Every structure is written in structure tokens, then in C-alpha cells.
A paper describes a structure:
Interleukin (IL)-18 belongs to the IL-1 superfamily and was first discovered as an interferon gamma (IFN-γ)-inducing factor in sera from mice with hepatitis stimulated with Propionibacterium acnes and lipopolysaccharide1. This proinflammatory cytokine is secreted by various types of cells and strongly augments IFN-γ production in type-1 helper T (Th1) cells and natural killer (NK) cells following activation of NK-cell cytotoxicity; thus, it plays a critical role in inflammation and the host defense against microbes. [name]/IL-18Rα/IL-18Rβ ternary complex formation juxtaposes the intracellular Toll-Interleukin-1 receptor domains of IL-18Rα and IL-18Rβ, to which the adaptor molecule myeloid differentiation factor 88 (MyD88) is recruited presumably with the aid of TRAM6. We determined the crystal structures of [name], the [name]/IL-18Rα binary complex and the [name]/IL-18Rα/IL-18Rβ signalling ternary complex at the resolutions 2.33, 3.10 and 3.10 Å, respectively.
The IL-18Rα ectodomain folds into three immunoglobulin (Ig)-like domains, which are referred to as D1, D2 and D3, in the same manner as the IL-1 receptors. Within IL-18Rα, D1 extensively contacts D2, whereas D3 is distant and is connected by the long D2-D3 linker, which implies that D1 and D2 behave as a single module, similar to IL-1-related primary receptors. IL-18Rα recognizes [name] through a large interaction surface area at ~1,850 Å2. Two [name] sites, Sites I and II, contact IL-18Rα; Site I is located on a side of the core barrel of the β-trefoil structure, and Site II is at the top of the β-barrel. In both the binary and ternary complexes, the segment between residues 35 and 40 adopts an α-helix structure with a cis Ala42IL-18-Pro43IL-18 bond, which is stabilized by hydrogen bonds and electrostatic interactions with IL-18Rα. Surrounding Site I, α-helix I mediated the interaction, wherein the Arg25Rα side chain is buried within the β3-α1 acidic groove of [name]. Two disulfide bonds, Cys22Rα-Cys41Rα and Cys43Rα-Cys81Rα, bridge the b1-c1 loop to the N-terminal loop and d1-e1 turn, respectively, which likely reinforce the proximal loop structure, to which the long β10-β11 hairpin of [name] is fitted. Around Site II, the IL-18Rα acidic surface, which is composed of the Glu253Rα and Glu263Rα carboxylates as well as Trp249Rα backbone oxygen, captures the Lys53IL-18 ε-amino group. In the [name]/IL-18Rα and [name]/IL-18Rα/IL-18Rβ crystal structures, seven N-linked glycosyl chains were identified in IL-18Rα at Asn91, 102, 150, 197, 203, 236 and 297. Interestingly, the core-FUC and second-NAG on Asn297Rα are proximal to the β4-β5 loop of [name] (<4 Å); hence, they likely interact through electrostatic and hydrophobic interactions with the ligand and partly contribute the unique D3:D3 interaction.
Author numbering:
A (entry chain A): 1 to 156
B (entry chain B): -1, 20 to 48, 52 to 315
């Protein structure tokens, strides 16, 4: 069981300081952005991280959301990353969820953050270069020390 | 080799060589590609090889040599059915500084932690004659002219504006690409593992019909949560109330957090039931349980 606690505004960045944003096609992407660029592209660059209480605690249970013409929530349904048109729910009556992720700092680096899927164990939110784009994808951990599954969240 | 400009809004400084690359370069291999500009309600115009002596149209990129204030506007690219839009905002150059303040990328680094600045420009490196690194418009002497690099453990004195200036040539004319980093050195956040104060299993003697305030306290970090689990899956006992959190900062800058679960009108339904209090963090979680007994 998950119960919505509180939400915060955050700027998610990969370990290359590339700002995560939802583009015109509602795809989550990563791009180098000057402070001005990050602001001028807001709200596409501003994410609502919502904390949840967990029935069986296993790290900080959160939902990543974005507020454009409509509020969309990040989902990893079928191991495929998408932004479902919905608000973070008040309640979740399951121990696993396509929208719940476990935010965990990396051991020794309290600023480097990883997001484990509650539905697909050992599957993490990651930045992958696909063609001339940096895409937000779901990836299995693989080799320990993987910097692609590590992020930084900047709060206001 | 260079990534496409996928973001919708772009901010550039006047007099700097600028480009915007579309996100279908492999596609640009199958004469059926066009670039357009729309000035303040001008309802677009098709750009051509010599529309402007500064604008160079290529299959994947639209080069500006250099970009100037009159270039501010909406740009649209069309290849068969692929379409891409950019809102270009050319800002005025601070001719009194070595960089415009409105074109900085801020970075906060914790004191004594690794700190590195590297000057690189993948796109124009073929035309780059020299590249210099300045700290608050004072040229630093780092042997490298190609990629001046600072690699050290951060100190409060390292705070400052680091500008990478890439000097290059295009048909005799000299230009530069300045990129500034606003570094801010802060004290070590030194996060702790959240710890719930008191024993893991607590038995609290109560009497039916009366009320009870189950106190839960922890030592945690500013961004950590403390909450109670008392069976809210399809509505909890209406007599159970989770009180407002209380926090007192420790001298070490950490927090003493308190959350009280108030069980009013105690009944048999509250007895021999585990009421859990958890502390949750990016650094770990910890739960303690309370049992109500006669
Ligand atoms: C990357 O490239 C950009 C260009 O793409 C470089 O930008 C140049 O930066 C310098 C400063 O770093 C600027 O110079 C300053 O201009 C200030 C204001 O200038 C005004 O008056 C000018 C008057 O006319 C002058 O130029 C014409 C030729 O155009 C001459 O014929 C004439 O005799 C004059 O000399 C105007 O033209 C201009 O538009 C402005 O309205 C000045 O306040 C400033 O003064 C410094 O130097 C003084 C001595 O000359 C000194 O006493 C002062 O204390 C002070 O230090 C300085 O001249 C350039 O204007 C600017 N050019 C552009 C196109 O933006 C950038 O430098 C480069 N990066 C690096 C690191 O090289
Ligand atoms: C949780 O902590 C609170 C304190 O924050 C404890 O409450 C305190 O409970 C005692 C009795 O158990 C109260 O003291 C005495 O009781 C009478 C009752 O009529 C009261 O009026 C007098 O103050 C008297 O000294 C005390 O007032 C009360 N304080 C508060 C703020 O309610 C509570 O017992 C702790 N819970 C557990 C499970 O230990
Ligand atoms: C309060 O906690 C007990 C104990 O739960 C254990 O510790 C938790 C922190 C978490 O990690 C649980 O998964 C652990 O089981 C809860 O009781 C357990 O409930 C689960 C699921 O209903 C069940 O599989 C276990 O057998 C139960 N264990 C015991 C000792 O009863 C209890 O449900 C929690 N109370 C509330 C109000 O949610
Ligand atoms: C930087 O470039 C110069 C040459 O630039 C010329 O002058 C500019 C103003 C512009 O008109 C450019 O298109 C010109 O090409 C390099 O200088 C030459 O270098 C050789 C050795 O490699 C030397 O023997 C010559 O005397 C130089 N020639 C001239 C005309 O200056 C210089 O090496 C370049 N710097 C670096 C570090 O690459
Ligand atoms: C350089 O970075 C610092 C830190 O991010 C910026 O300082 C902040 O400025 C705002 C107002 O603009 C204040 O409300 C904050 O309290 C400041 N923070 C600190 C830690 O001082 C600074 O503005 C940045 N400079 C530029 C030119 O962007
Ligand atoms: C654009 O502005 C520059 C000066 O900043 C000028 O030299 C150029 O001719 C202008 N071009 C057009 C088409 O307005
Ligand atoms: C372009 O057309 C192809 C089919 O020919 C289609 O699969 C593709 O999705 C289209 N691209 C866009 C951006 O609509």
C-alpha cells in the first residue's frame, strides 16, 4: 500500500549535468542547458517529485510528474518509459506500481540518485544515447557503478 | 557525432557562431529538407543558401556566422513528414565583461569534494585555433590551449565564474564561443542514516474507551520523512489521527523529528494491532512498531 505524503519541484539531471525535460512529442529527453535555457523551457524542465508512505518500506517511494497543459505522471509499464496523463494518486492499493520508484542515493555519494522500479525489481531509470538524442529509459543495473542510472535532483 | 538540439527554447548571445541541429540525421540521407523563420508575427519565410551572408543551410544543421539580435525568432524545419520547431532568443552581449550573466550554467559543489572544469566544443573543434579558460575574466594558466582543464578538490576560494572561450576562424574573420559556469562552493551536507529513537517493539498499556498518544521520534536529515501506518487502505479507524510533525535542529544541523499517532476512543479493534512508524530517506528506511494492550 502507498499513501501520498507531499510533493516538491525538482530539476533532474544526469551525471553529465544534462537537464531532463519532456519535449514537444511528450518524450523524456536529456539536454545541456544554461540556467536561462532551463527557466525558458519550464515547465517542461520542472518535475513534481511526490513522496509516498509504503506498507513495506524499501527506500524513498516517489512518483515523477510534470505540469504542462495537463499533469502527466512517469510510468514504466511493460518496461517502456512513458508519461501517462494523470495526477499522482492519493492511494495505491498494491506493493508494486508502474508509477512508484524507489529513490536511493548511491553509497558514498549522497547526491547521486538512483530510481528503482517498484514493479520491475533491479530495473532503474536511466539516460541512454539513442541516435542524436539522450533518452530517459528503463534499464537492468548490469555492471556495478553504472553512471547512466545515476542522477541529481535540484530543489527550489 | 554531435547531438541534435532537441529542446524547444534556445538562448544565445549576439556575435557568437551558433547552430541548431535537427533530430533526424540518419533520415537526412534518403532536396526534400527546408528551414523557415518567423519574426514577431511574420507567418514564416523559407531560408535559402544565400538568404543571409551569415546563415549557412546544411542537411542536418542551420549555421549562424555569427548569430545577431535580428535572428531572434521561431525556426521551423521540415523533411518529408518530420517537423521540428525552435524558439530562438538572441540576447545582447555584455561588452563590459568577458561573458553575459544571462548565459551561465550554475553548479554547486560541496567543499573538499572533487571539482572539474573542461573546455570542449565537439562541433566547432575543427575551426578552433585556441581555447582559453578565465575565472572572473582573469585568464588562468593551464598548460593546455586545446582543452584547458581544472581538476582539484573544491575549496571555498574556487567559487567564481569560469568562462571557456573557444577562439576560431571562418573565412578570415575571428570569432569565439564563450561558455560560463557559475560555481558555488557550499559546506559539506554530511548526511546521516535516519535512526528511529527508542525500542523497535513497544507495548503500551491502554484502557478501552480512553485515548492514547503514541509518540514516535527520530534523528534524520532535512529532506527525510517520518510517517505512521495505521491501516488507511480502504479508510482507517475514524478515531485514529496522525498529528503534525515537529522538528528541532541538532547543533550538527540534523533534525529531531516527532510524529504522534493519536488513537481516540480505544476499542478491541485497536488492541493486538501493530501501528508502525517509519522514517524514510534516500539514505535508507527504519520502522518501529507499537502494540496496544489491556
Ligand atoms: C568574443 O567575441 C566578441 C565579439 O563577437 C567580443 O566582443 C567584444 O568585447 C569587447 C570587450 O571584451 C568590446 O569592447 C568594449 O566596448 C565597450 C563599449 O563600446 C561601445 O563603444 C564603441 C565605440 O566604437 C569603438 O569601436 C569602433 C569600431 O567598431 C572604433 O572605430 C572606435 O574607435 C571605437 O574604439 C562601439 O563600437 C560599441 O558598439 C559600444 O557602444 C567599451 O566600454 C570597452 O572599453 C574597454 O577598453 C577601453 C580602451 O579601448 C578601456 O579604456 C576601458 O577601461 C575598457 O576596458 C571595450 O572597448 C567589444 O565591443 C565587443 N565586440 C562585440 C562585437 O560585441 C569578445 O571580446 C570575444 N571574447 C574574447 C574573450 O575575446
Ligand atoms: C507521549 O508523550 C506525551 C507527552 O508529550 C505523554 O503525555 C503525558 O501523559 C501524562 C500521563 O500519562 C500526563 O501527565 C499527568 O496526567 C494528567 C491527566 O489528567 C495531566 O493532566 C497532568 O499533566 C499529569 O501530570 C501529561 O499531561 C501528558 N502530556 C501531554 C502533552 O499529553 C504520553 O503519555 C506519551 N505516550 C506514551 C504512549 O507514552
Ligand atoms: C506493521 O508492521 C507489521 C510488520 O511488518 C514487517 O515490517 C514492515 C516494516 C514491512 O517490512 C513488512 O513487510 C514486514 O512484514 C505488519 O505485519 C506484516 O504484514 C505483512 C503484510 O500484511 C504480512 O505478510 C506479515 O506476515 C505481517 N507480519 C506480522 C508480524 O504481523 C503490519 O501489517 C503493519 N501494520 C500496518 C497497520 O500496516
Ligand atoms: C591560429 O591561426 C594562425 C593563422 O590564422 C590566419 O590569420 C587569421 C586572422 C585568419 O585570417 C585565418 O584564416 C588565417 O589562417 C596560425 O598561424 C600560422 O601558423 C603557422 C604554423 O602552423 C605559421 O608558420 C604561420 O606563420 C602562421 N600564419 C599566419 C598567416 O598567421 C596559428 O598557428 C593558429 N594557432 C593555433 C594554435 O592553431
Ligand atoms: C550563481 O549561483 C548562485 C547560487 O545558485 C546564485 O545565487 C542565488 O541568487 C538568488 C537571486 O538571484 C538568491 O535568491 C539565492 O539565495 C542565491 N544563492 C546563493 C547560494 O547565494 C547567483 O545568482 C548565480 N549567478 C548568476 C549570474 O546566475
Ligand atoms: C542583422 O543585424 C546586423 C547587425 O547586428 C546587420 O549587420 C545585418 O545586416 C542585419 N541583417 C538583417 C537581414 O536584418
Ligand atoms: C512519418 O511517416 C512514417 C510513415 O511513412 C511514420 O511511421 C512516422 O511516424 C512519421 N513521422 C512523424 C514524425 O509523424
Amino acid at each position: 500500500y502507498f499513501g501520498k505524503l507531499e510533493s516538491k519541484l525538482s530539476v533532474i539531471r544526469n551525471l553529465n549535468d544534462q537537464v531532463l525535460f519532456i519535449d514537444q512529442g511528450n518524450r523524456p529527453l536529456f539536454e545541456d542547458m544554461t540556467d536561462s535555457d532551463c527557466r525558458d523551457n519550464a515547465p517542461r524542465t520542472i518535475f513534481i517529485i511526490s513522496m509516498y508512505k509504503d506498507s513495506q518500506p524499501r527506500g524513498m517511494a516517489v512518483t515523477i510528474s510534470v505540469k504542462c497543459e495537463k499533469i502527466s505522471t512517469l510510468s514504466c509499464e511493460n518496461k517502456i518509459i512513458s508519461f501517462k496523463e494523470m495526477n499522482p494518486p492519493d492511494n495505491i492499493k498494491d506493493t508494486k506500481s508502474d508509477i512508484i520508484f524507489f529513490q536511493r542515493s548511491v553509497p558514498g555519494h549522497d547526491n547521486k540518485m538512483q530510481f528503482e522500479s517498484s514493479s520491475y525489481e533491479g530495473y532503474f531509470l536511466a539516460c541512454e544515447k539513442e541516435r542524436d538524442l539522450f533518452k530517459l529509459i528503463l534499464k537492468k543495473e548490469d555492471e556495478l557503478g553504472d553512471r547512466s542510472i545515476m542522477f541529481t535532483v535540484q530543489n527550489e | 557525432p554531435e547531438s541534435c538540439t532537441s529542446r524547444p527554447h534556445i538562448t544565445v548571445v549576439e556575435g557568437e557562431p551558433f547552430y541548431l541541429k535537427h533530430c533526424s540525421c540518419s533520415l537526412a540521407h534518403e532536396t526534400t529538407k527546408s528551414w523557415y523563420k518567423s519574426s514577431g508575427s511574420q507567418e514564416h519565410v523559407e531560408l535559402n543558401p544565400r538568404s543571409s551572408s551569415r546563415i549557412a543551410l546544411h542537411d542536418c544543421v542551420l549555421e549562424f556566422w555569427p548569430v545577431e539580435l535580428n535572428d531572434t525568432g521561431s525556426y521551423f524545419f521540415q523533411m518529408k513528414n518530420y517537423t521540428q520547431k525552435w524558439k530562438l532568443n538572441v540576447i545582447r552581449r555584455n561588452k563590459h565583461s568577458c561573458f553575459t550573466e544571462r548565459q551561465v550554467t550554475s553548479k554547486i559543489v560541496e567543499v573538499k569534494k572533487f571539482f572539474q572544469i573542461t573546455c570542449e566544443n565537439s562541433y566547432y573543434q575543427t575551426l578552433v585555433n585556441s581555447t582559453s579558460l578565465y575565472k572572473n575574466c582573469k585568464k588562468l594558466l593551464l598548460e593546455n590551449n586545446k582543452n584547458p582543464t581544472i581538476k582539484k578538490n573544491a575549496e571555498f576560494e574556487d567559487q567564481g565564474y569560469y568562462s571557456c572561450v573557444h577562439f576560431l576562424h571562418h573565412n578570415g574573420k575571428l570569432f569565439n564561443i564563450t561558455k560560463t559556469f557559475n560555481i558555488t562552493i557550499v559546506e559539506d551536507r554530511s548526511n546521516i542514516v535516519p535512526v528511529l529513537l527508542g525500542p523497535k517493539l513497544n507495548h503500551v498499556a491502554v484502557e478501552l474507551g480512553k485515548n492514547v498518544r503514541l509518540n514516535c521520534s527520530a534523528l534524520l536529515n532535512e529532506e527525510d520523512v517520518i510517517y505512521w501506518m495505521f491501516g488507511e487502505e480502504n479508510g482507517s479507524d475514524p478515531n485514529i489521527h496522525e498529528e503534525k510533525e515537529m522538528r528541532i535542529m541538532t547543533p550538527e544541523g540534523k533534525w529531531h523529528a516527532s510524529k504522534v499517532l493519536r488513537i481516540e476512543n480505544i476499542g478491541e479493534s485497536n488492541l493486538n494491532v501493530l501501528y508502525n512508524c517509519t522514517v524514510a530517506s534516500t539514505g535508507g528506511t527504519d520502522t518501529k512498531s507499537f502494540i496496544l494492550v489491556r
